[PDB]
Amino acid sequence: ATFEIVNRCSYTVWAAASKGDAALDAGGRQLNSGESWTINVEPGTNGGKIWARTDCYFDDSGSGICKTGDCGGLLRCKRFGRPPTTLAEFSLNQYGKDYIDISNIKGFNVPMNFSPTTRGCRGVRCAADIVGQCPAKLKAPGGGCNDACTVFQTSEYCCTTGKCGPTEYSRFFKRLCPDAFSYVLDKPTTVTCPGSSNYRVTFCPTA
């Protein structure tokens, strides 16, 4: 599959792509305002994620840090990023179909649109000003809006027992971004696309 990762934000972001235990394509790259980065994800990829990172500093060897979304200090991510991270989640070629969604379960840092560039399905979007409206106890000093599980580490926020309902904090993400997962057991907003579709992730789609 082909993902075009586009940065429409006015600021630089450092895109990242990983499936948890390995990089997707190069795994990460700097994206100046307006730049596009085309990556190739192997078909059948399960549990792949794409996200943006803000205020990064990497040396000439690819080691450093980001204020949001840092993946063990690497420019090229092999693991998932540190919350808060708006997440483009996708599983490809699952019994003939692709499955995409946007998740706020790990917080929010950059607005994002996740759409197919091919036939057969719709796109999802979470482009509201969640950082600007973030509740005080969830605001991340490094920028972005943390999820309640990251902040408080309780069974109810993290859904560790498989029993959990919506919360005041999850209802906030759901109110601003109804098309994104607000907590683990949220009513799924996953979009079913034709197998081997191609996609575009646009950071700050309304910029």
Side-chain angles (χ1 to χ4, degrees), residues 157-198:
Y157 294 140
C158 306
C159 297
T160 54
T161 68
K163 316 165 306 184
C164 63
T167 65
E168 281 300 89
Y169 295 127
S170 77
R171 286 187 191 91
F172 159 77
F173 292 95
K174 203 63 176 186
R175 178 173 56 85
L176 271 66
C177 281
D179 285 343
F181 282 86
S182 59
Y183 67 114
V184 177
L185 297 196
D186 200 345
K187 197 233 267 188
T189 47
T190 307
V191 173
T192 299
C193 287
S196 304
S197 292
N198 298 325

Side-chain angles (χ1 to χ4, degrees), residues 118-133:
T118 56
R119 45 135 284 124
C121 51
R122 67 176 174 101
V124 284
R125 178 174 294 191
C126 176
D129 182 15
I130 284 181
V131 178
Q133 303 291 9

Side-chain angles (χ1 to χ4, degrees), residues 103-120:
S103 172
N104 285 316
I105 298 171
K106 291 295 174 180
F108 178 98
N109 70 335
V110 175
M112 152 193 302
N113 179 96
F114 190 5
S115 291
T117 63
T118 56
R119 45 135 284 124

